[PDB]
């Protein structure tokens, strides 16, 4: 028996396909099953998008209040509901956008990138920028959800993402005073609890992007920590086509996926 035997009976067991990225590091070899398939990012993009945002703007563009209207909420969106009538900072989308998958806060933040009718080409871009040349986002929230299996649009892969999240915290795609807001943005996330961090030990660093979508998709990527502070980024995307559009997601798929990675990087000698 070998991790994609172990891999391919998760598969089995939940009825699912899924996608698994640890790059290589010094130490250890890449961790890759369906690592070049495309998945559904959902809320995954995030991230890079609170990235894309830091790095086009200095700090005080944080403070920057944004006003928008119960026209612009079309989505799920916990934070912004609470304060359409007054208005958040761009640093308050952010955290919203990573911390809640606030699905208004991502729609303004793509408009901060991109303008009204460009946001999805310019989040794309930042990726190309960064040279990811696979990945695509096409739609807004909650569209970007919904497209059906084996559609391009709106995916990556999850060998494409950890790439990319490697670089925004582990490599210099952001100064250290912006990379810092949103690695903390990353680590106080609300949403990830049953995921990546589950199937890591406590003594281990974790800081995560969830998401969640139709056809039972369910994904979430993290950069973890050895208790010493050796770091490895981590990438489990996951959907569940034979139930249709309304499949379940299983968060407990992400977890023993993220549990068997856990014991390749945590085993010695």
Same mark, same amino acid.
């Given at each position: 028996?070998?991790?994609?035997?172990?891999?391919?009976?998760?598969?089995?067991?939940?009825?699912?396909?899924?996608?698994?990225?640890?790059?290589?590091?010094? #130490? #250890? $070899?890449?961790?890759?099953?369906?690592?070049?398939?495309?998945?559904?990012?959902?809320? #995954?993009?995030?991230?890079?998008?609170?990235? $894309?945002?830091?790095?086009?703007?200095?700090?005080?563009? =944080?403070?920057? =209040?944004?006003?928008?209207?119960?026209?612009?909420?079309?989505?799920?969106?916990?934070?912004?509901?609470?304060?359409?009538?007054?208005?958040?900072? +761009?640093?308050?989308?952010?955290?919203?956008?990573?911390?809640?998958?606030?699905?208004? $806060?991502?729609?303004?933040?793509?408009?901060?990138?991109?303008?009204?009718?460009?946001?999805?080409?310019?989040?794309?871009?930042?990726?190309?920028? @960064?040279?990811?040349?696979?990945?695509?986002?096409?739609?807004?929230?909650?569209? @970007?959800?919904?497209?059906?299996?084996?559609?391009?649009?709106?995916?990556?892969?999850?060998?494409?993402?950890?790439?990319?999240?490697?670089?925004?915290?582990?490599?210099?795609?952001?100064?250290?005073?912006?990379?810092?807001?949103?690695?903390?943005?990353?680590?106080?996330?609300?949403?990830?609890?049953?995921? +990546?961090?589950?199937?890591?030990?406590?003594?281990?660093?974790?800081?995560?992007?969830?998401? #969640?979508?139709?056809?039972?998709?369910?994904?979430? +990527?993290?950069?973890?920590?050895?208790?010493?502070?050796?770091?490895?980024?981590?990438?489990?995307?996951?959907?569940?086509?034979?139930?249709?559009?309304?499949?379940?997601?299983?968060?407990?798929? =992400?977890?023993?996926?993220?549990?068997?990675?856990?014991?390749? =990087?945590?085993?010695?000698?």
């Amino acid at each position: 028996m070998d991790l994609a035997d172990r891999f391919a009976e998760l598969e089995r067991r939940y009825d699912a396909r899924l996608g698994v990225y640890v790059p290589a590091t010094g #130490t #250890t $070899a890449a961790i890759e099953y369906r690592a070049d398939e495309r998945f559904a990012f959902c809320c #995954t993009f995030k991230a890079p998008l609170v990235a $894309a945002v830091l790095h086009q703007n200095p700090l005080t563009h =944080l403070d920057k =209040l944004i006003t928008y209207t119960s026209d612009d909420i079309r989505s799920i969106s916990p934070v912004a509901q609470q304060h359409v009538q007054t208005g958040m900072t +761009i640093g308050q989308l952010c955290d919203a956008a990573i911390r809640y998958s606030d699905g208004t $806060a991502a729609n303004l933040l793509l408009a901060d990138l991109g303008g009204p009718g460009g946001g999805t080409a310019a989040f794309t871009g930042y990726l190309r920028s @960064l040279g990811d040349t696979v990945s695509r986002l096409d739609a807004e929230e909650p569209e @970007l959800n919904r497209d059906p299996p084996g559609d391009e649009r709106d995916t990556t892969t999850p060998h494409a993402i950890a790439l990319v999240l490697q670089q925004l915290v582990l490599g210099n795609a952001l100064p250290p005073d912006k990379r810092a807001l949103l690695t903390d943005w990353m680590a106080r996330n609300t949403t990830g609890a049953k995921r +990546i961090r589950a199937g890591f030990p406590a003594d281990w660093k974790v800081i995560d992007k969830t998401g #969640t979508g139709d056809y039972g998709r369910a994904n979430d +990527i993290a950069v973890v920590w050895s208790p010493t502070g050796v770091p490895y980024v981590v990438a489990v995307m996951s959907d569940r086509a034979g139930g249709g559009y309304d499949a379940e997601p299983r968060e407990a798929l =992400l977890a023993e996926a993220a549990t068997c990675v856990a014991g390749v =990087l945590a085993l010695e000698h």
